[PDB]
Structure formats: structure tokens, C-alpha cells
Coordinates of N, CA and C and ligand atoms in Angstrom, one line a residue:
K1 N 224.3 114.0 77.2 CA 225.0 115.0 76.3 C 226.1 115.7 77.1
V2 N 227.2 115.9 76.4 CA 228.3 116.7 77.0 C 228.2 118.1 76.2
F3 N 227.8 119.1 76.9 CA 227.8 120.5 76.2 C 229.2 121.1 76.1
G4 N 229.3 121.9 75.0 CA 230.4 122.8 74.9 C 230.1 124.0 75.8
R5 N 231.1 124.7 76.2 CA 231.0 125.9 77.1 C 230.0 126.9 76.6
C6 N 230.3 127.4 75.3 CA 229.4 128.4 74.8 C 228.0 127.9 74.4
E7 N 227.9 126.6 74.0 CA 226.6 126.0 73.7 C 225.7 126.0 75.0
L8 N 226.4 125.7 76.1 CA 225.6 125.7 77.4 C 225.2 127.1 77.9
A9 N 226.2 128.0 77.7 CA 225.9 129.4 78.0 C 224.6 129.9 77.3
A10 N 224.6 129.6 76.0 CA 223.5 130.0 75.1 C 222.2 129.3 75.6
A11 N 222.2 128.0 75.9 CA 221.0 127.3 76.4 C 220.5 127.9 77.7
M12 N 221.5 128.2 78.6 CA 221.1 128.8 79.9 C 220.5 130.1 79.8
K13 N 221.0 131.0 78.9 CA 220.5 132.3 78.6 C 219.1 132.2 78.1
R14 N 218.9 131.3 77.2 CA 217.6 131.1 76.6 C 216.5 130.8 77.6
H15 N 217.0 130.0 78.6 CA 216.1 129.5 79.7 C 216.0 130.4 80.9
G16 N 216.5 131.6 80.7 CA 216.3 132.7 81.7 C 217.2 132.8 82.9
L17 N 218.4 132.1 82.8 CA 219.3 132.1 83.9 C 220.3 133.3 84.1
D18 N 220.5 134.1 83.0 CA 221.4 135.2 83.1 C 220.8 136.3 84.0
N19 N 221.5 136.5 85.1 CA 221.1 137.4 86.2 C 219.9 137.0 87.0
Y20 N 219.5 135.7 86.9 CA 218.5 135.2 87.7 C 218.9 135.3 89.2
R21 N 218.0 136.0 90.0 CA 218.3 136.3 91.3 C 219.7 137.0 91.5
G22 N 220.1 137.8 90.5 CA 221.3 138.5 90.6 C 222.6 137.8 90.2
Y23 N 222.5 136.5 89.8 CA 223.7 135.7 89.4 C 223.9 135.7 87.9
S24 N 225.0 136.3 87.5 CA 225.3 136.5 86.1 C 225.5 135.1 85.4
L25 N 225.3 135.1 84.1 CA 225.5 133.8 83.4 C 226.7 133.1 83.7
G26 N 227.9 133.7 83.8 CA 229.1 133.1 84.1 C 229.1 132.2 85.4
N27 N 228.4 132.7 86.4 CA 228.2 131.9 87.6 C 227.6 130.5 87.3
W28 N 226.6 130.5 86.5 CA 225.9 129.2 86.2 C 226.8 128.3 85.3
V29 N 227.5 128.8 84.4 CA 228.4 128.0 83.5 C 229.5 127.5 84.4
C30 N 230.1 128.3 85.3 CA 231.2 127.9 86.1 C 230.7 126.7 87.1
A31 N 229.5 126.9 87.6 CA 228.9 125.8 88.5 C 228.8 124.5 87.8
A32 N 228.3 124.6 86.5 CA 228.1 123.4 85.7 C 229.4 122.7 85.4
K33 N 230.4 123.5 85.0 CA 231.7 122.9 84.7 C 232.2 122.1 85.9
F34 N 232.2 122.6 87.1 CA 232.8 121.9 88.2 C 231.9 120.9 88.9
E35 N 230.6 121.1 88.7 CA 229.7 120.0 89.2 C 229.7 118.8 88.4
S36 N 229.7 119.0 87.0 CA 229.4 117.8 86.1 C 230.3 117.7 84.9
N37 N 231.2 118.7 84.8 CA 232.0 118.8 83.6 C 231.2 118.9 82.3
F38 N 230.0 119.6 82.5 CA 229.1 119.9 81.4 C 228.4 118.6 80.9
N39 N 228.3 117.5 81.6 CA 227.7 116.3 81.2 C 226.3 116.1 81.8
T40 N 225.3 116.1 81.0 CA 223.9 116.0 81.6 C 223.7 114.6 82.3
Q41 N 224.5 113.6 82.0 CA 224.3 112.3 82.6 C 225.0 112.0 83.9
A42 N 225.7 113.0 84.4 CA 226.5 112.8 85.6 C 225.7 112.5 86.8
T43 N 226.1 111.5 87.6 CA 225.5 111.1 88.8 C 226.6 110.9 89.9
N44 N 226.3 111.2 91.1 CA 227.3 110.9 92.2 C 226.5 110.6 93.4
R45 N 226.9 109.6 94.1 CA 226.3 109.2 95.4 C 226.9 109.8 96.6
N46 N 226.1 110.3 97.5 CA 226.6 110.9 98.7 C 226.6 110.0 99.9
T47 N 227.3 110.3 100.9 CA 227.5 109.4 102.1 C 226.1 109.2 102.8
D48 N 225.2 110.1 102.8 CA 223.9 110.0 103.4 C 222.9 109.1 102.7
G49 N 223.4 108.6 101.5 CA 222.5 107.7 100.7 C 221.8 108.4 99.5
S50 N 221.8 109.8 99.6 CA 221.2 110.5 98.5 C 222.2 110.5 97.3
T51 N 221.6 111.0 96.2 CA 222.4 111.0 94.9 C 222.2 112.4 94.3
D52 N 223.3 112.9 93.6 CA 223.2 114.1 92.9 C 223.1 113.8 91.4
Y53 N 222.2 114.6 90.7 CA 221.9 114.2 89.3 C 222.1 115.4 88.3
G54 N 222.7 115.1 87.2 CA 222.7 116.0 86.0 C 223.7 117.1 86.0
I55 N 223.5 118.0 85.1 CA 224.5 119.0 84.8 C 224.7 120.0 86.0
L56 N 223.7 120.1 86.9 CA 223.9 120.9 88.1 C 223.8 120.1 89.4
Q57 N 223.9 118.8 89.3 CA 224.1 117.9 90.4 C 223.1 118.2 91.6
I58 N 221.8 118.1 91.2 CA 220.7 118.4 92.1 C 220.5 117.1 92.9
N59 N 220.3 117.4 94.2 CA 220.3 116.3 95.2 C 218.9 115.7 95.5
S60 N 218.9 114.3 95.6 CA 217.6 113.6 95.8 C 217.1 113.7 97.2
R61 N 217.9 114.2 98.2 CA 217.3 114.4 99.6 C 216.2 115.4 99.6
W62 N 216.4 116.5 98.8 CA 215.4 117.6 98.8 C 214.6 117.8 97.6
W63 N 215.2 117.5 96.4 CA 214.7 118.2 95.2 C 214.0 117.3 94.2
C64 N 214.3 116.0 94.2 CA 213.7 115.1 93.2 C 213.5 113.7 93.8
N65 N 212.7 112.9 93.2 CA 212.5 111.6 93.7 C 213.2 110.6 92.9
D66 N 214.0 109.7 93.5 CA 214.7 108.6 92.8 C 214.3 107.3 93.4
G67 N 213.3 107.3 94.2 CA 212.8 106.0 94.8 C 213.7 105.3 95.7
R68 N 214.9 105.8 96.1 CA 215.8 105.2 97.0 C 216.4 106.1 98.0
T69 N 215.8 107.2 98.3 CA 216.3 108.1 99.3 C 215.2 108.2 100.4
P70 N 215.3 107.4 101.4 CA 214.2 107.4 102.4 C 213.9 108.7 103.1
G71 N 212.7 109.1 103.3 CA 212.3 110.3 104.0 C 212.8 111.5 103.3
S72 N 213.0 111.5 102.0 CA 213.4 112.6 101.3 C 212.2 113.4 100.8
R73 N 212.5 114.6 100.4 CA 211.4 115.4 99.7 C 211.7 115.4 98.2
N74 N 210.7 115.9 97.5 CA 210.8 116.1 96.1 C 210.2 117.4 95.8
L75 N 211.0 118.5 96.2 CA 210.5 119.9 96.1 C 210.3 120.4 94.7
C76 N 211.1 119.8 93.7 CA 210.9 120.2 92.3 C 209.8 119.3 91.6
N77 N 209.3 118.3 92.3 CA 208.2 117.5 91.8 C 208.5 116.8 90.5
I78 N 209.6 116.1 90.5 CA 210.1 115.5 89.3 C 210.9 114.2 89.6
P79 N 210.9 113.2 88.8 CA 211.8 112.1 89.0 C 213.2 112.6 88.7
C80 N 214.2 112.2 89.5 CA 215.6 112.6 89.3 C 216.1 112.2 87.9
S81 N 215.6 111.2 87.3 CA 216.0 110.8 85.9 C 215.7 111.9 84.9
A82 N 214.7 112.8 85.2 CA 214.4 113.9 84.3 C 215.5 114.9 84.2
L83 N 216.4 114.9 85.2 CA 217.5 115.8 85.3 C 218.7 115.3 84.5
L84 N 218.6 114.2 83.8 CA 219.7 113.6 83.1 C 219.5 113.8 81.6
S85 N 218.4 114.4 81.2 CA 218.0 114.6 79.8 C 219.0 115.5 79.1
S86 N 219.1 115.4 77.8 CA 219.8 116.3 76.9 C 219.2 117.7 76.9
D87 N 217.9 117.7 77.2 CA 217.2 119.0 77.3 C 217.3 119.4 78.7
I88 N 217.9 120.6 78.9 CA 218.2 121.1 80.3 C 217.0 121.8 81.0
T89 N 215.9 121.9 80.4 CA 214.7 122.6 80.9 C 214.4 122.2 82.4
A90 N 214.3 120.9 82.7 CA 214.0 120.4 84.0 C 215.0 120.8 85.0
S91 N 216.3 120.7 84.6 CA 217.4 121.1 85.5 C 217.4 122.6 85.8
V92 N 217.1 123.4 84.8 CA 217.0 124.8 84.9 C 215.9 125.2 85.8
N93 N 214.7 124.7 85.6 CA 213.5 125.0 86.4 C 213.7 124.7 87.8
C94 N 214.3 123.5 88.1 CA 214.6 123.1 89.5 C 215.7 124.0 90.1
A95 N 216.7 124.3 89.4 CA 217.8 125.2 89.9 C 217.2 126.6 90.3
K96 N 216.2 127.1 89.5 CA 215.6 128.4 89.9 C 214.9 128.3 91.3
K97 N 214.3 127.1 91.6 CA 213.7 126.9 92.9 C 214.7 126.9 94.0
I98 N 215.8 126.2 93.7 CA 216.9 126.1 94.7 C 217.6 127.4 95.0
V99 N 217.9 128.2 94.0 CA 218.6 129.5 94.2 C 217.7 130.5 94.9
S100 N 216.4 130.3 94.8 CA 215.5 131.2 95.5 C 215.3 130.8 97.0
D101 N 215.9 129.7 97.4 CA 215.6 129.1 98.7 C 216.1 129.7 100.0
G102 N 217.1 130.7 99.8 CA 217.7 131.3 101.0 C 219.2 131.4 101.0
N103 N 219.9 130.4 100.6 CA 221.4 130.5 100.6 C 221.9 130.8 99.2
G104 N 221.0 131.0 98.2 CA 221.5 131.4 96.9 C 222.3 130.3 96.3
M105 N 223.4 130.7 95.6 CA 224.2 129.7 94.9 C 225.1 128.9 95.8
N106 N 225.2 129.3 97.1 CA 226.0 128.6 98.1 C 225.5 127.1 98.2
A107 N 224.3 126.9 97.8 CA 223.7 125.5 97.8 C 224.6 124.5 97.0
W108 N 225.4 125.1 96.0 CA 226.3 124.3 95.2 C 227.7 124.4 95.7
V109 N 228.1 123.3 96.3 CA 229.5 123.3 96.9 C 230.6 123.7 96.0
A110 N 230.5 123.2 94.7 CA 231.6 123.5 93.8 C 231.5 125.0 93.4
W111 N 230.3 125.6 93.4 CA 230.3 127.0 93.1 C 230.9 127.8 94.2
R112 N 230.6 127.4 95.5 CA 231.1 128.1 96.6 C 232.7 128.0 96.7
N113 N 233.2 126.9 96.3 CA 234.6 126.6 96.5 C 235.4 127.0 95.3
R114 N 234.8 127.0 94.1 CA 235.6 127.2 92.9 C 235.2 128.3 92.0
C115 N 234.1 128.9 92.2 CA 233.6 130.0 91.4 C 233.4 131.3 92.1
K116 N 232.8 131.2 93.3 CA 232.5 132.4 94.1 C 233.8 133.2 94.3
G117 N 233.7 134.5 93.9 CA 234.8 135.4 94.1 C 235.8 135.4 93.1
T118 N 235.6 134.6 92.0 CA 236.5 134.5 90.9 C 236.0 135.3 89.7
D119 N 236.8 135.5 88.7 CA 236.4 136.2 87.5 C 235.5 135.3 86.7
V120 N 234.2 135.2 87.0 CA 233.3 134.2 86.3 C 232.9 134.6 84.9
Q121 N 233.1 135.9 84.6 CA 232.8 136.4 83.2 C 233.7 135.6 82.2
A122 N 234.8 135.1 82.6 CA 235.7 134.4 81.8 C 235.0 133.2 81.2
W123 N 234.0 132.7 81.8 CA 233.3 131.5 81.4 C 232.4 131.7 80.2
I124 N 232.1 132.9 79.9 CA 231.3 133.3 78.8 C 232.0 134.1 77.7
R125 N 233.3 134.3 77.9 CA 234.2 135.0 77.0 C 234.3 134.3 75.7
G126 N 234.1 135.1 74.6 CA 234.2 134.5 73.3 C 232.9 134.0 72.7
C127 N 231.9 133.9 73.5 CA 230.6 133.2 73.1 C 229.7 134.2 72.4
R128 N 229.0 133.7 71.3 CA 227.9 134.4 70.7 C 226.7 134.3 71.5
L129 N 226.3 135.3 72.3 CA 225.1 135.2 73.1 C 224.1 136.3 72.7
Ligands
CL1 CL1 229.2 136.6 83.8
CL2 CL1 221.8 135.6 96.8

């Protein structure tokens, strides 16, 4: 599924991401835009052999099992394919574990490079929330 910007903001708010660990909703919408272009089916392979999955590009080295990332962990206890669903619940629940892990949203390279320190409220402007 490719979400609209406001549709995704609404879904994320419903799932408890607005101000989760102090990160306002716009941060999450911005991260999703630049990680996946709001596409739940996005995948990208990394040089180390791991793959990033779904709307928030969650990585198989640590967070999910894809059966092809040797010696990896599965800290979210889910198959990586669950992160590609039209239902964002699994992605949100895993993202909450990631952002609690110590480096906050800096875990997402696109967030650090393209959202951090910018006017992220713009991402939710105009939306019925
Ligand atoms: Cl915001
Ligand atoms: Cl933080």
C-alpha cells in the first residue's frame, strides 16, 4: 500500500507514535517519506547482506528474521515479511522498540540526514488529526 501523507499521519497517531519517546508525529511521517516514499512494500538490500523492510525500512541484521541474514538477531520477534503489510501495526510496534534502544531516531539514516533539525511539523500541516 502507498499511503497518503495525512492518511499515514492518522494511522501513526492511532498507533501511539505522536510524541513517543518525545518525537512528535511529524518526525515519524518525515522518516517514512524518505525511507520508503510511504510504500509499505519497500525493500532495499544493504552491503552487509541484510535487507531493510517496509514503510520504516527496518533492518534484518537486528530486528526481524528473513531467513537469509546469517548470525542476525530478530529483536522484534517477527518475520521481516510482516513489515510489508498494508496494516502498519507490526512496523509501528517494532519501531517503538528501536527508538527506545539508545540512539533514538538516529537509528534511521534518512531521519538523521533529512528530517532532524528541520521544520517537521510541515509534514502534518493540513491534516485532520
Ligand atoms: Cl510534528
Ligand atoms: Cl531520544
